[PDB]
Design a protein around this ligand. Sequence first.
Ligand SMILES: CC[N+](CC)(CC)Cc1ccccc1
Ligand SMILES: O=P([O-])([O-])O
Ligand SMILES: [Mg+2]
Ligand SMILES: [Mg+2]
Ligand SMILES: [Mg+2]
Length: 340
Amino acid sequence: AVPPSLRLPVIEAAFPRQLHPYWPKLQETTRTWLLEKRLMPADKVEEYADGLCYTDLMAGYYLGAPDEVLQAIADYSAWHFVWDDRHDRDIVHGRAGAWRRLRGLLHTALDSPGDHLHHEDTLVAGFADSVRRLYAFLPATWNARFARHFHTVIEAYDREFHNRTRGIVPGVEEYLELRRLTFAHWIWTDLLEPSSGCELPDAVRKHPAYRRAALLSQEFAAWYNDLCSLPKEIAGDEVHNLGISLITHHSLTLEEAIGEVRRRVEECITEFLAVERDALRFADELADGTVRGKELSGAVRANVGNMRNWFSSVYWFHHESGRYMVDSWDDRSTPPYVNN
Ligand SMILES: CC[N+](CC)(CC)Cc1ccccc1
Ligand SMILES: O=P([O-])([O-])O
Ligand SMILES: [Mg+2]
Ligand SMILES: [Mg+2]
Ligand SMILES: [Mg+2]
């Protein structure tokens, strides 16, 4: 029962949700990883980890992924949620120095994860572990692309630190550009490829239909998160949210802003449906009677399929995850699962 202001009938009707068969073991294994990597307090893992639905989110996304690939992705993704929490806490505590140091360590670990597997900062060591494993699936050219994209993500998180420390709410267009980095659009897009077991040639993944399908999948996800995470974000003095940018700089009321975000979210869906058709047509063109062509076709098809799955996985994640249930918290400004 999704609340009216959050409900999207098109997703519920035309985007049936999927579940990777490895999910039952995935949920257990990632939880054990969080504990052993000491990324969250043991009591908070016990009480909140399963209810956070982080593994569910990934298992509803990267369908067809080899089990060990899904495991590395799930561990990374859970880590990223914890990083977002650490980032938030450093901000509210004014820990500029601690953040700067972490920021610098993540950059270095990104290029040389093996060196950071046992760093004193458990967050850094956990990052390096998931990254080292992700670097073991595809050629070095894919690893370099992943690294390049993530360096940009880290710097986007630093810009967020800058903004919140100074009390700046980004303009609408400024936010939209920034959001493609803080949501890590291109990381999720990169991870499509190890999931289907094929590093795509540039001419394939930069095909206008593949590019646009990939973009719309991520825009929907980020903006829908903005819609659903808005209550807890307002309560927690978060400034990064399309709704917040609209209220601040466009003189919109909360109701009007929510409506504007909804419309932009809804447009992603129908625009995706159009481009999805073009992307699948491209997939057909790739199937040229050669083994290589069959391979590229199957990969693009699997990838576009997962771009579609992201819609439904993200939609239901926000309904199920304990991460956004601010009304159930003792202190609305302080989520119970974060280390304060
Ligand atoms: C902060 C959480 N996350 C993923 C770890 C960072 C990019 C974005 C996200 C939120 C909600 C659903 C999906 C992704
Ligand atoms: O980053 P990119 O390679 O363009 O995707
Ligand atoms: Mg964030
Ligand atoms: Mg956040
Ligand atoms: Mg959010």
